[PDB]
Fold this sequence. Notes:
The structure is a homodimer. Chain A is mainly beta and about 220 residues long. In chain A, strands 1, 2, 3, 5, 7, 8, 9, 10 and 11 form a nine-stranded parallel sheet that branches. In chain A, strands 4-6 form a two-stranded parallel sheet. The first copy, chain A, has helices spanning about 20-30, 200-210, and strands spanning about 15, 30-35, 35-40, 40-45, 50-60, 60-65, 70-80, 90-100, 110-120, 130-140, 150-160, 160-165, 180-185, 200, 215. Strand 14 (about 200) of chain A pairs parallel with strand 15 (about 215) of chain B.
Amino acid sequence: MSISNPRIPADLIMVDDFSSYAQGYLYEEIPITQIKIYGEHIEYFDFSKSEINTSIFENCTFLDCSFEGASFVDVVFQNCNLSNSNFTDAYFERCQFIACKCVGVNMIDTIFKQTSMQRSNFQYSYFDKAKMTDIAFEDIDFTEVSITEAKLKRFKAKNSHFIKNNFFKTMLTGVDFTKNELVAPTVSSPPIEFQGAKISMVQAADLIGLWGIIVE
Amino acid sequence: MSISNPRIPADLIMVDDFSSYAQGYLYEEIPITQIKIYGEHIEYFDFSKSEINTSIFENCTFLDCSFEGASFVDVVFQNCNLSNSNFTDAYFERCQFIACKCVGVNMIDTIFKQTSMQRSNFQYSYFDKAKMTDIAFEDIDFTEVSITEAKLKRFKAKNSHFIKNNFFKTMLTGVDFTKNELVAPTVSSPPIEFQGAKISMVQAADLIGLWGIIVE
């Protein structure tokens, strides 16, 4: 990786119940710091405006939770299920997602910096108007992810699935798609969003075929 | 070719001086019929509204002449040089071009029927708004030829060089380019003019270059 890793101390306070540990810090507007959460299962809970750093989430399940307006800095999510949780206006810096289920997740208007995700599933998610900078994907399922009006810089991906994506108004100059799956993207006419992008011969033939032309 | 050949009898007179001969038939509004023209060299001459059939041009040179609104039926051009001549609004039926130099000819608004071109050079020529039906190209140089807003039906080509053509609004459904060179075509977005056409994998990677997309 060319990405700065989360900077986490060796001594982490293990925490019992996160749902109510956080209540104090939300109230008083204080950073949650240096903790480890493990084995939780929480649904429909409001964690909006949490300001979290230097912590690890492990084997946790946050379904349909709000993280609207939250921030995460030097944070690992490892083997978590965040499906259908709402992260609109959230901020991420030096974060890692590893082996996570993030189906139907709402990441609209987010800011990501120096973040990597590996072996995780993001099907049916929304990354519209996200601004993402210094990002690395490995083995990521991005099937049916909407990501219109986004702003990407130093974004790389390998072995990842960009299938049925809406890329409308999102410029992809300098992105290399050759070691990934690119299938059935939605783009403008003409297709500026792919100007300066790099694809494979097969990707080009599939794409031309898409627009009604026969290829050998 | 299952294309009707020119139907020319053996009963031909050989004309000495084509310029003089043609003026008589032009002044009297009568058709030129059953002649062989050989070895002429004519420049800047007006043959507009000429009507010519059952005839053969061999080894003739017509530079910057007008055949505007002319008519050619059952005619053969062989080893001719028609470079920069103006055939705008002309009509061609059961004709053949064989080893001709037709650099920069104006074929705008023409009609072609049952016509075949072999070993001929058409570069820098204009074919806009042409109607072409039952056509065969064999070893044709079509470099930098403009052919916008044209109607093509039963069009076939082989070993021909379609390079840097403007195809804007010319539907090429059914046309097979796999046995030809096709480079740098200009088309609409979406690219309707190649809907239903057949191209090679190499040719598809080239076409997509129009929009600035890079391919390995």
